[PDB]
Amino acid sequence: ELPSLEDLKVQEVKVSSSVLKAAAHHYGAQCDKPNKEFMLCRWEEKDPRRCLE
Amino acid sequence: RWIARTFFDGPEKNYERTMAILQIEAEKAELRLKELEVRRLMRARGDGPWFHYPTIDKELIDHSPKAT
User: Fold this and answer.
1) Chain A residue closest to B63 (CA)?
2) A42 and A51 Cβ atoms separated by less than 8 Å
3) Over the range B21-51, which residues count as b (16 or more CB within 10 Å of their CB) and which as e?
4) What is the Cα–Cα distance from B45 to B41, expressed in whole angstroms?
5) Per the CB < 8 Å rule, is A46 touching B67?
6) Rounded distance, CA A48 to CA A50, Å?
7) What SS3 state is found at A40?
8) Could you give the 3-state DSSP secondary structure of residue B26?
9) A42: closest chain B residue by CA
């Protein structure tokens, strides 16, 4: 199968609460390009193994 | 000689004829043997458009879903 390494997951994550993120949808307007790059990666290549960087 | 006319076909007939009937008969026998040979092959291996079972679908969906 060959999965990704142990030190592949990015540090400093999930510090915010579930509704704290939902409180501001301004995240959809500002910082949207890197979110759309990952989104376009997923529809082209379905595997999470390639789109992790 | 009187019996030969208007009552007899003649030796020329059924010699030029019958061979014509045999010519159709030879075509009828060889193609029927070929049909028995073709159906013996087409049923065993799915190569030609004879005894072919229907498939599921040619085209169903290709549009982008909300998949993971």
Assistant:
1) A43
2) yes
3) eeeeeeeeeeeeeeeeeeeeeeeeeeeeeee
4) 6
5) yes
6) 6
7) helix
8) helix
9) B68
